Design a protein around this ligand. Structure first.
Ligand SMILES: *[C@@H]1O[C@H](CO)[C@@H](O[C@@H]2O[C@H](CO)[C@@H](O[C@@H]3O[C@H](CO[C@H]4O[C@H](CO)[C@@H](O)[C@H](O)[C@@H]4O)[C@@H](O)[C@H](O[C@H]4O[C@H](CO)[C@@H](O)[C@H](O)[C@@H]4O[C@H]4O[C@H](CO)[C@@H](O)[C@H](O)[C@@H]4O[C@H]4O[C@H](CO)[C@@H](O)[C@H](O)[C@@H]4O)[C@@H]3O)[C@H](O)[C@H]2NC(C)=O)[C@H](O)[C@H]1NC(C)=O
Ligand SMILES: *[C@@H]1O[C@H](CO)[C@@H](O[C@@H]2O[C@H](CO)[C@@H](O[C@@H]3O[C@H](CO[C@H]4O[C@H](CO)[C@@H](O)[C@H](O)[C@@H]4O)[C@@H](O)[C@H](O[C@H]4O[C@H](CO)[C@@H](O)[C@H](O)[C@@H]4O[C@H]4O[C@H](CO)[C@@H](O)[C@H](O)[C@@H]4O[C@H]4O[C@H](CO)[C@@H](O)[C@H](O)[C@@H]4O)[C@@H]3O)[C@H](O)[C@H]2NC(C)=O)[C@H](O)[C@H]1NC(C)=O
Ligand SMILES: *[C@@H]1O[C@H](CO)[C@@H](O[C@@H]2O[C@H](CO)[C@@H](O[C@@H]3O[C@H](CO[C@H]4O[C@H](CO)[C@@H](O)[C@H](O)[C@@H]4O)[C@@H](O)[C@H](O[C@H]4O[C@H](CO)[C@@H](O)[C@H](O)[C@@H]4O[C@H]4O[C@H](CO)[C@@H](O)[C@H](O)[C@@H]4O[C@H]4O[C@H](CO)[C@@H](O)[C@H](O)[C@@H]4O)[C@@H]3O)[C@H](O)[C@H]2NC(C)=O)[C@H](O)[C@H]1NC(C)=O
Ligand SMILES: *[C@@H]1O[C@H](CO)[C@@H](O[C@@H]2O[C@H](CO)[C@@H](O[C@@H]3O[C@H](CO[C@H]4O[C@H](CO)[C@@H](O)[C@H](O)[C@@H]4O)[C@@H](O)[C@H](O[C@H]4O[C@H](CO)[C@@H](O)[C@H](O)[C@@H]4O[C@H]4O[C@H](CO)[C@@H](O)[C@H](O)[C@@H]4O[C@H]4O[C@H](CO)[C@@H](O)[C@H](O)[C@@H]4O)[C@@H]3O)[C@H](O)[C@H]2NC(C)=O)[C@H](O)[C@H]1NC(C)=O
Ligand SMILES: *[C@@H]1O[C@H](CO)[C@@H](O[C@@H]2O[C@H](CO)[C@@H](O)[C@H](O)[C@H]2NC(C)=O)[C@H](O)[C@H]1NC(C)=O
Ligand SMILES: *[C@@H]1O[C@H](CO)[C@@H](O[C@@H]2O[C@H](CO)[C@@H](O)[C@H](O)[C@H]2NC(C)=O)[C@H](O)[C@H]1NC(C)=O
Ligand SMILES: *[C@@H]1O[C@H](CO)[C@@H](O[C@@H]2O[C@H](CO)[C@@H](O)[C@H](O)[C@H]2NC(C)=O)[C@H](O)[C@H]1NC(C)=O
Ligand SMILES: *[C@@H]1O[C@H](CO)[C@@H](O[C@@H]2O[C@H](CO)[C@@H](O)[C@H](O)[C@H]2NC(C)=O)[C@H](O)[C@H]1NC(C)=O
Ligand SMILES: CCC(CC)O[C@@H]1C=C(C(=O)O)C[C@H](N)[C@H]1NC(C)=O
Ligand SMILES: CCC(CC)O[C@@H]1C=C(C(=O)O)C[C@H](N)[C@H]1NC(C)=O
Ligand SMILES: [Ca+2]
Ligand SMILES: [Ca+2]
Ligand SMILES: [Ca+2]
Ligand SMILES: [Ca+2]
Ligand SMILES: [Ca+2]
Lengths: 388, 388, 388, 388
C-alpha cells in the first residue's frame, strides 16, 4: 500500500513469550528437511516467515556431509512458513548465495544475496522478487552482510555490509536502498573498530543495529542510523555485561568507545534492544562456546558503563547448544507500540557434535510481553544418537 | 466481514452422517505424518480444518519414541486441510504449546497456546495470526484449556481455563476475549466441582460447554455462558446415562448438582448437545477404557435425572480404540439452523498398544442429519504389527 | 458467476489428442502416492482436476496390502491437480466414502460420497464444500452411483444412483439436485434392464449417460436426461459394436431395447459420445478382460442396429491393462462447441498382477481434435517387478 | 491485462550475475525429485518459473533406469517455483509430451507439447491452461520444437518447429500463434541449412532465435522474426568463435551463410544475444563434449566474420558437465531495458556418467549486469558415488 514508517516506540519488555519454534532437526531425522544455518525471521504486512541459508541438501541426504563449510555454490536464501521446518517442498528461494539480508518496506520485499569466491564476491539486490541492482566486492575479501532482517522507513532500507579482514580493520559500508536501487552509501564512521553481521530494528524513525566486532571486542558494536538524513553513528555497548562469545568474564565497568579486550578474532552474531531502562541484552550463557542463551534487562546498557542486570530470562539452558541470534519485529501489527522480538539459532552437528558429518540448526524465537511471564527453556530437541 | 452472531438454533438431530476422516496412522506408516494427540475441528467462514497438538516429530521418525508424554517444548498447535493427515508439509502452526483452543469470530481467528513448566506456564492469545495478549499461570499447576474450539458471538469469544490440581479443587476461569484482548474474566461459579477440557458450541446467543470433572464426577459438568452479559452458570448433566470414562455402570437416577461418584481422579474430554428432546450424548462404550464410541439421544438429559436413551448410533466399535471427543459446528453454512458436529480422537500406540514406543491418533468426525441414516463404525484402521 | 447452461453442441471428433496422464504407479514406486481406483476428471470454471477414490494408504506402505477390496471405512473421494499423481501431500478430500460423483454447476461444486455397510449405506451431498443433503439406502444393497462426473444445466445437476442387486433387477433412481438440495427424483424408466456407473456429458440442453448393465447386457444402456423438464428415457446402444467387458464377439446386428446376451453378471464402467455421424465408442480391445482400449467412430451407433466402425484410434495396446473409462468436458472453455473428452483407468496390481498385494491405477485422458492426428498408445508404464 | 509489446532494447551486458540454481540432483539424492532434461526458464507477469521435461519418475526410484531415452509416453512439460527442484509435490504439468515450448503473452500463457511415435507425432497448443489447437506431423519424422521459451508481441507468439531428418535437410516451419490459434505459418527461408531447438528473445519489436544446425554447422543458425509482418530471415553467426558442440577448433574467419564444416550430425541446443557491440555468445568450453560453459563478448558476432572475444565470463568449469542452454528474459520487470538472461542445463548421469542407470540434470541460470562483476563457477554439485 504505502511505505511503512517507523512511527511507534517499543512496547515495554517485562518478559518474553514463545513466538515460533520449528523443531527442524527433530523432524528432519525422518523427513525432507533442508540443511541450513544463519536463520532469521522477517515479516511482510500479511505474514511472518522463517528465513535461512540452505546448504542445498537434506539432513539425512548423503550431501549433508561437509555442510560445516560456509560458502559453496549450493547455498541459497530460503523462506518458509512460520514455525514449519525448511523442507524441500515448502521452502521458497529468495536468491542464491552464502550471506544475506531481507526486509519488507510496506509495499514489497527487498532480498540481498552475496555469492562468489572469497576474492570476487558480489551482492545482488532483489526487489519485488526480481534482480534490480548488483554491487561488486570492494575489498576482495568475502563481501558479507547482516544474516538477519534489514529495516525500512518511508521506502529507505539501510543495510550494513563488510568486505575485508575478519581479524583486522575492514571496509564496512552502509548502503541506503529504495526500491532495490542505491540512493547513497557511506563508509562506517564512529568508534566501532570492526563490524560484522548487524542485527537491526527500528522505532520512532531511528534504526538501531547491534553487530559483532570479530577482531577485538567482546562488548558489541552498535550502529544507529537516521534513515531520513541517511547518516549514522557507531559506538559499543558501554555495559560490563559482555554479550559476544567467546568472551572474558564480566568486569564491573565496560567500554563505550573501544572494544573490550580479552578475546581476539572470534565472536557470534547477536543483538540487543537499547531503549533506556527498557533495555534488554541477549547472550550465550557460556563465555567459552555457543551454549545456552539468556535475556538480561540492563537499564541504560548502551550509555552506562557500570550497568548491571535488574531482571532476566533464560531462553536455552547452558547444557544445550545455541548459536546466532538476531532481531526482528512485526511492523504491521495492531497497537500503539512495536513488540520487540528475536530468534536464536540452535546449532546441531559440527563442530561440537562431530559424530555426524553435517552441521545444521533449528530456530526458536520469542517476542516481548508487558506481563511478567513464567519462563521455560527451549532446546533444539533432537537426539544426535538417532542420526548415527 | 462482520462478527458472527449465534442467531440460529440447532438442526434436529435424527442421526449422524460421516463428515471427515484422515486415516492419519494408516497413511503415516509410510509418509511424513506428524505424531499428534488432542485433535479437534474448527471452521473459518470459507474453510473447515482439522487441528491438533503436534509432538514435533513424524510417527516413523526415531523421535516418536516417548510421545506418550504430554508437555514438551516440541509441541505446537497445527491445523491442516479437512480430512488430510497432519503431514510435515501441509501443517500450519497456529502457535507453540501443549494445550490449546481456537475459534473464528467471523472476521478473523483467535488461537491460544499454553506452554511452560508445570509451575510456570503461560497462555499466549493470537488474533489474526499475531500474538496479542499473554496470561501467566495463576495457580502454578499446569495452566490448561479446552483442547477443542471456542465459540464467538458479536466479537466476544469466551474460553474456559483451569489452573491447579487435577485431583482436588482447582481454579477455573472463564475469560471473555474480543480481538485477542481480555474484556473480562470470572471465576467458575455454579455447582460443577471441577472443570477441565470444555467442549463448546453455540446457538441462539447462548454458549454451552460440556466439560470433564477429573476429580470426582463420572457425569459431565456443564457450563452455559451468556456472551452478551458475559456471565455463566454451571451444573452437571442430570442423566443416569453417564458419559465420562472410566465410569461406574449406569444407575437409574443421576445427579444434577454433584459429581456422580464411583471413579476418582481420571476421565476423558467429551461433549454433548443439550437441546430439550433434541439432546444427544457421546461416550465411550467401555466403562473401563477409551474403547468404542457411541451417540445416545437422551431427551432432556441436562435437566431430567432419570432420562434414558430413546435412540442411538454407534460410531466406533468397542473393539477399537477411541479417546477424546469434542464439539464444533460450521457457523457459516447455509440454512436456517446450525448442524451439530463432533470429532472422536482415535488413539493408537501407548499406553494400550505398547509394542510401539509412540502415541498418536487419527480423527473421525460426524455432523447431524435430519434423515434417519444407516450406521457404520469408523475405526482408525492401522495395523500396529506393520510398525514393528 | 451464473449457472452454466449447456448451450453448445459437440465439436466434430476427427481424432483424439493427449490431454492428461499422471504416471501415478511409476512415480509412486518411490514417493508418497495414494493407492486409488475409480478415477475420473472434472472441471471447475478456472481449473480441471483428476479425481479418484483413495484407499487411505500409499502404494509402498504396508497398508496397501488388501486394496483390491472395494468398500472400507478408509476410502475417500480426492481431487488433485491435472496430470500430477494423487500424493498424500497434494490430494484434497472432497468427501468420505466408496462410491462417488462430482460436478461444478458454474457457481460452485457438488460432490456426493456414499459410505456404509452393504445393507445400510447412505449418500451425503456436499455443495460449496459443505454437507447439505443426505439420502439413506432404499434397497439395502450397496447404494452406489456414477464413479465419474455428473453434469449441470441452469443449476440442475442430475445424478444416477442404483441400489439393489448387481445380478438381477435393481432400483435405479435419477435425482435432480440444485445447490445440493433435492428438487425431484424419478425411478428409472425406458428399456434399460439394469443400470450401474453412468458416464455422462451434456450438449444443447440434453444430458447423455452411457452406463453399464451388469446383469445381462454386453451392449451399453443409455439414459438421456432433460434437465429442464427433469425427465429421462432409457435404451441400449443399437450397434453390433459391443462395448462392455467381458463380452461376446461382435455380431452383425445389435439390440436397441434389450441387453445383448452372452455374458452375465459382470462388466466395466465405460462411455460413449452419441451424436449422429459424430458418434464415437470406447471399449477394451480384449473381449475377455480389462486389456487395451480403443475409440471407434460408429456413425449413428445409438439408433442403427447394424452400425459398424468407419474410423478408429487405439488408446492402449491389448498388451497393457486398462479398466474403467468415462466422460467429462470442459464446459468453460472458449469456442463455439464442447470438446468431447474421456479418461481411461489403467489398473495395476490385483487381480491380474498378483505378485503384489495391492491394487491401484494411473490415469490417461484424451479430448477430441478436429484434425486427423497420428496415434500413439498410452500405457501405465510401471514395471511390477520393481515393487517385489 | 494487455498484450505485452517488445518496446525495450537490451540492457548493456557488462557481466552476468547469478539468477537461479536448483541443485536438483544434490537434493534429489534424498527426496522426491523428478528425473528431467530439456529445462528452461520462463516468466509470467507476476512470477518467473523453472520448466523441463519430466521422465515420469523420481531419480532414486527404480523407474529412473533408462531415462537416457528421449521420447516415451511418461514424459510431460512441468514448471515449478524458481530455484526449487522439480519435485513430485511442487511440479505443475503444463502438457504431456517429449518436446516443448512455452511463453506468456501478457494476458495468459501458451504451452506446446509434442507427443507421438517417430512417424506420427502431433503438437497440441494449450492457451490459458486449455487445449486449443493441434498440428499433425508433416514429415513423419519426429516433429519437434524449441525446448526453451517462445516470445510474444501484441498477442503474436512465433514458434519454430522442425520435422524430418536430423542428419540431412528437414522441414522447418515458423508458426505465428495468437491465443493458441494459428494466424499463419511459413516454411523456413534464408541461408540456414538446418534448424533445431531455437533459443529466442525479443527486443524493439524483433524476435531473435539462435538455433542449432545438427546436420553440418558448428557455427549457429539464426532466425530473426518480425512478429508484426509475420515474416523472418535466416543466416548463421558470422563469427569464427564457434558455439555448437562438438565442434572444430576456432578459425580466424567464420561463415555468414553456410554451416562451418568439420563436424556432422551432432550438436547441442545453445543461444546468444546479438546486439552490435553488446553481443554475447554462450558455449561449452570443450570442443568435444558437453563440458564447461562460458559467455564471450564478441562485438558484432552476427555480421562480422572475423569477430573475436573482447571480454568473457566462465559459468561452469571444463571439469564439470553442462548441456543445453537457452535464452529468456523477464519482459515484465521495471526499468527501461530488457535484462538478458539464460540458463545452462547441467546434465548428470548417462551417457558420461554410466555408473548410474539414469540421466537427469539440474539448472543454473544468470542474467546480465551493467556492473563488471567478479565471476564464480556454478557446477551441478552432486557426487555420483552417493547414488551407487
Ligand atoms: C517462574 O518464572 C519467573 C519468570 O522468569 C522466575 O523468576 C525469574 O527468575 C530468574 C532467575 O532467578 C530471574 O533472573 C535473574 O535476574 C537477576 C536480576 O534480578 C536480581 O537482581 C536485581 C538487581 O539487584 C534485584 O532487583 C532482583 O530482586 C533480583 O535480586 C539477574 O542478575 C540474573 O542473571 C545473573 O545470573 C544468571 C544466573 O542466574 C547468569 O546466567 C546471568 O548472566 C547473571 O549473572 C552473571 O552476570 C552478572 C553481571 O555481570 C554477574 O554479576 C554474575 O556474577 C554472573 O556472572 C557470571 O556468569 C555470566 C554468565 O555465565 C558470565 O558471563 C560472567 O563472566 C560470570 O561468570 C537472572 O537473569 C528473573 O529476573 C526472574 N523474573 C521475574 C519476573 O521475577 C521464577 O523463578 C520462576 N519460578 C520458579 C518456581 O521456578
Ligand atoms: C441400519 O441403520 C440403523 C440406523 O442406525 C440401525 O438402527 C439403529 O439400531 C441401533 C442399535 O439397535 C439403535 O440404537 C440403540 O437405540 C436404543 C434406543 O431405542 C430402543 O429403545 C427405545 C426407548 O424405549 C425404543 O423407543 C426403541 O424402539 C428401541 O426399542 C438404545 O437404548 C441403545 O443403546 C443402549 O444399548 C447399547 C448396546 O446396543 C449400549 O451400548 C448403549 O450404551 C445403551 O445401553 C446401555 O445404556 C443404557 C442406559 O443406561 C442401559 O440401560 C443398558 O443396560 C446399557 O447399559 C450397559 O452398557 C453401557 C454401555 O456400555 C454401560 O455404560 C452401562 O453401565 C451398562 O453396562 C442403542 O443406542 C438405533 O436407535 C437404531 N436407529 C434407528 C433410526 O432405528 C439398523 O439396525 C441398521 N440395520 C441393520 C440391518 O443393521
Ligand atoms: C498414423 O496415425 C493415423 C491416425 O490414427 C493411423 O491411421 C489410422 O489407422 C487405424 C488403424 O488402421 C485406423 O483404425 C481402424 O479404422 C477402421 C475403420 O476404417 C476402415 O474401414 C472404413 C470403413 O469401411 C474405411 O472407410 C476406411 O478406409 C478403412 O478401410 C476400423 O474398422 C478399425 O477397427 C477394427 O479393427 C481393430 C483392429 O485394427 C479392432 O481392434 C477394432 O475393434 C475393429 O475391428 C473389430 O470390430 C469390428 C466391428 O465389429 C469387427 O468387424 C472386426 O472383425 C473386429 O472384431 C474383432 O475384434 C474386436 C476387438 O477386439 C472384438 O470385440 C470382436 O468380437 C472381434 O474379435 C480401426 O479402428 C484409423 O481409422 C486410421 N485413422 C486415420 C485418420 O486414418 C496411421 O496408420 C498411423 N501411421 C502409421 C505409419 O502407423
Ligand atoms: C574476478 O572477476 C573478474 C570478472 O570476471 C575476472 O576478470 C575476467 O577474467 C576473465 C578471464 O581472464 C576474462 O575472460 C577472458 O576475456 C578475454 C578477452 O579479454 C582479453 O582480450 C581483450 C581483447 O584484446 C583485451 O581487451 C582484454 O584486456 C584482455 O586482454 C577472452 O579472450 C578470454 O576467452 C578466451 O580464453 C578462454 C580461456 O581463458 C577460453 O576458454 C575462451 O574460449 C577464449 O579463448 C579461446 O577462443 C579464442 C577465440 O577463438 C581463441 O583465440 C583462443 O585461443 C581460445 O581458443 C581455444 O579454446 C576454445 C575454448 O576451449 C576452443 O573452442 C578453441 O578451438 C581453442 O582450442 C576470457 O573470456 C574477463 O573478460 C575478465 N573480466 C573482466 C571484467 O575483467 C578476474 O580475473 C577475477 N579475479 C581474480 C583474482 O580471479
Ligand atoms: C509514510 O510516510 C510518507 C510521507 O513521508 C507517506 O507518503 C505519503 O503518502 C500519501 C498517500 O500515498 C501521498 O499522497 C504522499 O505524497 C506520500 N509521500 C511523500 C513522500 O510525501 C506514507 O503514506 C506514509 N506511510 C503510511 C503507511 O502512512
Ligand atoms: C452481529 O451483530 C452486530 C450488532 O450487534 C452487528 O454489528 C453491526 O454491524 C453493522 C454493519 O457492520 C454496523 O453498522 C453496526 O454498528 C454493528 N455493530 C454494533 C455492535 O452495533 C453485526 O453486523 C452482526 N453480524 C452479522 C454478520 O450480521
Ligand atoms: C443460464 O440460464 C439462466 C436463464 O435460465 C440465466 O439466468 C439468468 O441470469 C440473469 C443474470 O444472473 C438473471 O437476471 C436471470 O433471472 C437469471 N435466471 C433465470 C433463471 O431467469 C443464466 O445467467 C444463464 N447462465 C449464463 C452463464 O449465461
Ligand atoms: C500493445 O500494443 C497494442 C496496440 O497494438 C495495445 O493494444 C491497444 O490497447 C488498448 C487498451 O487495451 C485498446 O483500446 C487498443 O485497441 C488495443 N489494441 C490494438 C491492437 O489497437 C496494447 O495495449 C499494448 N500493450 C500494452 C501493455 O501497452
Ligand atoms: C568471513 C568470516 C566471518 C567471520 C569469521 O565468517 C562467518 C562466521 C560464522 C560463524 O561464526 O558461525 C558463519 C558465517 N556463515 C560466516 N560468514 C561467511 C560469509 O562465511
Ligand atoms: C530427434 C533428433 C534430435 C537431434 C539429434 O534429438 C534431440 C537431441 C538431444 C540431445 O542432443 O541431447 C535431446 C532431445 N530430447 C532430442 N529431441 C527429441 C525430440 O528426442
Ligand atoms: Ca521418504
Ligand atoms: Ca568479538
Ligand atoms: Ca471423571
Ligand atoms: Ca454387462
Ligand atoms: Ca552442429
Amino acid at each position: 500500500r504505502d511505505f511503512n514508517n517507523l512511527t511507534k516506540g517499543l512496547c515495554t519488555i517485562n518478559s518474553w513469550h514463545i513466538y515460533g519454534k520449528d523443531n527442524a532437526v527433530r523432524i528432519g531425522e525422518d523427513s525432507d528437511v533442508l540443511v541450513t544455518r544463519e536463520p532469521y525471521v522477517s515479516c511482510d504486512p500479511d505474514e511472518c516467515r522463517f528465513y535461512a541459508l540452505s546448504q542445498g541438501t537434506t539432513i539425512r541426504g548423503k550431501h549433508s556431509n561437509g555442510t560445516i563449510h560456509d560458502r559453496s555454490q549450493y547455498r541459497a536464501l530460503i523462506s518458509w512458513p512460520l514455525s514449519s521446518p525448511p523442507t524441500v517442498y515448502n521452502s521458497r528461494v529468495e536468491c542464491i548465495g552464502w550471506s544475506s539480508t531481507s526486509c519488507h518496506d510496506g509495499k514489497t520485499r527487498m532480498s540481498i544475496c552475496i555469492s562468489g569466491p572469497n576474492n570476487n564476491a558480489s551482492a545482488v539486490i532483489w526487489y519485488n522478487r526480481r534482480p534490480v541492482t548488483e554491487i561488486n566486492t570492494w575489498a576482495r575479501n568475502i563481501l558479507r552482510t547482516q544474516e538477519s532482517e534489514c529495516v525500512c522507513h518511508n521506502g529507505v532500507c539501510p543495510v550494513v555490509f563488510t568486505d575485508g579482514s575478519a581479524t583486522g580493520p575492514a571496509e564496512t559500508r552502509i548502503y541506503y536502498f529504495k526500491e532495490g536501487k542505491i540512493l547513497k552509501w557511506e563508509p562506517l564512521a564512529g568508534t566501532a573498530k570492526h563490524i560484522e553481521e548487524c542485527s537491526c530494528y527500528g522505532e520512532r524513525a531511528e534504526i538501531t543495529c547491534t553487530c559483532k566486532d570479530n577482531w577485538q571486542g567482546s562488548n558489541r558494536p552498535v550502529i544507529r542510523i537516521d534513515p531520513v538524513a541517511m547518516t549514522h553513528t557507531s559506538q559499543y555497548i558501554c555495559s560490563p555485561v559482555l554479550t559476544d562469545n567467546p568472551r572474558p568474564n564480566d568486569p564491573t565497568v565496560g567500554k563505550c568507545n573501544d572494544p573490550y579486550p580479552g578475546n581476539n578474532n572470534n565472536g557470534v552474531k547477536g543483538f540487543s534492544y537499547l531503549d533506556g531502562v527498557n533495555t534488554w541484552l541477549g547472550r550465550t550463557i557460556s563465555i567459552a562456546s555457543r551454549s545456552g542463551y539468556e535475556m538480561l534487562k540492563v537499564p541504560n546498557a548502551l550509555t552506562d558503563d557500570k550497568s548491571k542486570p535488574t531482571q532476566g530470562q533464560t531462553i536455552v539452558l547452558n547444557t544445550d547448544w545455541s548459536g546466532y541470534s538476531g532481531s526482528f519485529m512485526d511492523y504491521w501489527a495492531e497497537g500503539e507500540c512495536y513488540r520487540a522480538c528475536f530468534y536464536v539459532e540452535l546449532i546441531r552437528g559440527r563442530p561440537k557434535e562431530d559424530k555426524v558429518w553435517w552441521t545444521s540448526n533449528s530456530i526458536v524465537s520469542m517476542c516481548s510481553s508487558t506481563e511478567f511471564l513464567g519462563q521455560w527453556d527451549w532446546p533444539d530437541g533432537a537426539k544426535i544418537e538417532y542420526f548415527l
